[PDB]
Amino acid sequence: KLLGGGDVDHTQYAFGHTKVFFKAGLLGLLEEMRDDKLAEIITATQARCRGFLMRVEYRAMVERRESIFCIQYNVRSFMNVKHWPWMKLFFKIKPLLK
């Protein structure tokens, strides 16, 4: 599972029942080239993701747009009102109703 990550040559090694097998300094050389080749492959695959990642953030930010406001204004009311005679009145009274 670990080797899952890294911009490393997924060639240069080999697993087996008790251990992994690894090249050097040639196989070592191979991998390196390989490594660069994934930055490419990778670096490019990262980007889109990154891109895309934020692209979903905008869809959320936007949705949220109003639900906030609603929340925004809504609170403010109360802060103003809660101190108003008439509103306290309505309050004690609001229950006797049906």
């Binding site: 609603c70 929340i71 809504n74 609170v75 009102v81 309050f91």
Partner: protein
Amino acid sequence: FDETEIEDFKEAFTVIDQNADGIIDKDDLRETFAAMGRLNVKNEELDAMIKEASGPINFTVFLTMFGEKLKGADPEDVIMGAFKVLDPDGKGSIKKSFLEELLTTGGGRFTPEEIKNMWAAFPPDVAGNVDYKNICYVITHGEDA
């Protein structure tokens, strides 16, 4: 203003207008306060309520005065709608630091100082953003329940 909220203000207007003529005068204010237990209600409090209107308090003058003070008033079902979208997995009250960051970083109405005032009477859970629901109650009907 939904129609059941306007019917709640019509019922509160009828309980404060004890002469039942359609206009709440200063005697109605004082006799509604005395029937709630306020034997010491000063005349200056009644005059400050009447000083918020430009005319007599009939039903449409009482609705326009409450409209202009409650320009961001939200019913409990729409506040719980927005809090169910903030906790989209259901049941759990959302974290204190998540509501502080999302109020600030989205809007100017969610700036911090205001967030300290939110925690300040809306207690911990409410303030913190963990509980939920008690704040929707006190935003539609004030004071401690």
